């Protein structure tokens, strides 16, 4: 002998929420600017030699 059991309408499951995400584009390296260091080196010598 067994106990009776009636299945009701299933209870509401927790809702899943999908998502669409686009990644940020990386940074770009600063290109190689160059100073004429030697020019000022001659400069300080000339004003000094004076």
């Amino acid at each position: 002998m067994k106990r009776g059991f009636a299945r009701p309408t299933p209870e509401k499951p927790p809702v899943i929420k999908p998502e669409n995400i686009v990644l940020s584009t990386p940074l770009s390296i600063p290109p190689p600017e160059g100073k004429p260091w030697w020019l000022i080196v001659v400069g300080v010598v000339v004003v000094g030699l004076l």
Partner: protein, 50 residues
């Protein structure tokens, strides 16, 4: 040259012999800056970038 001549006319004669090396080295240094030197933004192709 005007400075040296003024000193020569005044009679110091300090620039005689090896003393002359100072005007000589200076005159070469000024020449390096004015004739070759380095360019501005109009000459984009500077050695380090090319």
């Amino acid at each position: 040259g005007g400075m040296v001549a003024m000193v020569f006319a005044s009679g110091s004669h300090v620039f005689g012999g090896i003393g002359s090396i100072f005007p000589l080295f200076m005159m070469v240094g000024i020449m390096m800056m004015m004739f070759r030197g380095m360019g501005g933004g109009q000459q984009q192709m500077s050695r380090p970038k090319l």
